[PDB]
Amino acid sequence: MTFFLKTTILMGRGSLENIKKLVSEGERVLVFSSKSMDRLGFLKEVIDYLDEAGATYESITGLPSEPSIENVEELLPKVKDFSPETFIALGGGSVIDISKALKVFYDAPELDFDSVAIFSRFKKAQPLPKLKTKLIAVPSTSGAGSEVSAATVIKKGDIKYTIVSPELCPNYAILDPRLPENMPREVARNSGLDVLVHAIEAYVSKASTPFSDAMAVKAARTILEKLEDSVNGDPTAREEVHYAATMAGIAFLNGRLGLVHAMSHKAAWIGPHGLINAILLPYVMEFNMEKAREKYDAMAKELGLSNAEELLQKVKELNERLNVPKLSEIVSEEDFTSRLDEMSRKAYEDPLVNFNPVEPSVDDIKNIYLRAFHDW
Amino acid sequence: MTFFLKTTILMGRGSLENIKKLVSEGERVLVFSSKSMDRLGFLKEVIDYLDEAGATYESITGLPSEPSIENVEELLPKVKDFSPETFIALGGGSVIDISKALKVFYDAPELDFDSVAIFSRFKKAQPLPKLKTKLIAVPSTSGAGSEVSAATVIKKGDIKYTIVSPELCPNYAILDPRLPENMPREVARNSGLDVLVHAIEAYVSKASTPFSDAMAVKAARTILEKLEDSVNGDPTAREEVHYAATMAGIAFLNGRLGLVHAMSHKAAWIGPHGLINAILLPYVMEFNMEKAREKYDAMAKELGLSNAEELLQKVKELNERLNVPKLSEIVSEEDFTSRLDEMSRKAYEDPLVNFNPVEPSVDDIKNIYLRAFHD
């Protein structure tokens, strides 16, 4: 049992200004940004800080959502050409994950994706050498927790795979609630429910400790109390949920995740995106609560509920109040059916299955997917 | 507003065996331990792991509690003689604090104590350069939180001063509850109440964040619920309180401490040791609550109490039930009244005052000490 944190976290409204203090005169900085963070003026704000710092900088913008290995490879020549000492990742989990993947392939150019990505928990991946490029993560959602995690989630053939290394942990995270105050309702809802998924999975993980549990319970408490207020546009709730998103990231960095993310990774072919975690969570909770009820009971008591059954009800009621669609509403029975057997096999191979409080069969995973689809 | 943790925390019963993982063949390792960690056979367990790792090692034992700069200077030549790459600090806050002070003076031999210790918050101390000696902190009490903190607490002339630098944060902390299970009742009480002092001062600190607050509340909740069970020999509660001490450590690494530790640093000339933080806490809370109730109320409600007034009552009741002495049991009215003025002046200059929710005068600190003596 281990607990660490590689990331120095700076927080508060206006904390984006810290960039001035983190970068030195003549430091070679490459800024990666989403279309959102460009349009909304946050990229300009970072450039003006780098200008005041007298840094040597360049900006790559309009990084895509749900990044592929092809997305990464297309950016890599620009990276090598500029020869940065420092990355700033301004945007969502998508932008922070693109930057982590570029950090690997820039700092360790002997390593290709196919050598380090965990395609199957039954096949060895190469560990990462020391990666010297400084990474400053500035999340715009609340949130993926990528600003502290050891993982980058990259698609190859419409399946999400991970590279996981403590070397990928961002050197610095800046948590400036001014950014997420700009999320559209559905982005605030989806990324806020991912916090709750992260917190519950980290708490019931085989890898859980009291240290990860303290962060996981507080993040979960904040989502259950504050998320509806944040989705309605309460700035105080937007701050609390932004910090809860990172608290859950600290939890799952140490505690790891579980079946929910193994099954959402391998259901990335489904649109809309960023729904499937929220939808699958209760079905995975009900499966795990069969043989491994104990840690769900423990978390429910810590959250001031009587038992695991009441925590499950609170999760289903929050999803209901935030109008999370049924799986059957966002995928046809034929398309779901034709991909089910391979999805279930690929999910079973995902390394997050090793942390799940119960070891699933392929058939157990297939039956969880079916249960979520039927919604009988 | 910042949150970090430089230390990798390894935990569980038998986690002491991780030493065999963290040390490579031919690594030069210097082990510091207390007499109790030698006598109870934890030093032999560590040497046995270093032997299995094929390390080049040496052991220094019989390290004093409440260490001085003279203590540290007397050991420095033995450190230089052996030329270690790695320290293992096996014992209480005292042993980890000695190990931290030696890491400064070994790694930066151009810096003396008088250049890096914060004698006064009104005068610059030198910042520390990169210190490359790896430090593995194995706390035996529950506890100082020194195994994750950026601080070492060293006496000069019977007053506690600090060196504070992220460079002093141990590389690794091993939390193995077999060690603190051996604490006699009084040591379990004193170090446990220190956790609660740490947790409350970190929460109400001017440098509090939601991250440090989460660690501080869970640490405080564990002490209020479990410390009596632990004092009474409950192995579950010993484990819980051991991890609570490090949580309060994470909390104060970030949040810092306040007027309780400023006042206990400058009252270091009182024996016994370890009581003064627990004695002073309620009086400092009452002082701070007059002007800055807000964070005490927030902490009370997090702990599922109705208000700041009830948290204060719960602290006072715990001290009562675990038989914390009054200040006038452990110091003559002669002694006290004679040093009160200079102690108050020197507590006022302690950098930890900068983090207290309320800026005290010297006279305020004088009157807190007076209310403690006169209860």
Ligand SMILES: NC(=O)c1ccc[n+]([C@@H]2O[C@H](COP(=O)([O-])OP(=O)(O)OC[C@H]3O[C@@H](n4cnc5c(N)ncnc54)[C@H](O)[C@@H]3O)[C@@H](O)[C@H]2O)c1
């Ligand atoms: N590496 C990890 O540990 C980890 C953990 C969980 C998820 N992920 C990955 O992260 C990705 C999802 O990241 P995400 O949830 O942050 O979303 P995202 O980065 O994919 O962005 C979602 C959408 O919201 C928009 N947006 C983001 N912030 C905005 C803001 N403040 N104002 C306006 N619009 C804004 C984006 O432009 C985009 O259209 C997925 O690829 C997922 O697999 C990573």
Ligand SMILES: NC(=O)c1ccc[n+]([C@@H]2O[C@H](COP(=O)([O-])OP(=O)(O)OC[C@H]3O[C@@H](n4cnc5c(N)ncnc54)[C@H](O)[C@@H]3O)[C@@H](O)[C@H]2O)c1
């Ligand atoms: N550096 C920091 O951040 C920090 C924080 C708090 C306190 N401190 C310092 O730490 C010191 C106090 O540390 P402490 O409270 O851990 O006590 P300690 O290290 O002074 O030891 C107290 C006594 O208990 C004995 N003991 C300790 N563990 C035992 C065990 N498991 N079994 C049997 N006997 C045991 C010791 O041998 C000693 O006699 C003080 O000098 C204080 O100023 C520093």
Ligand code: NI
């Ligand atoms: Ni997620």
Ligand code: NI
């Ligand atoms: Ni203390």
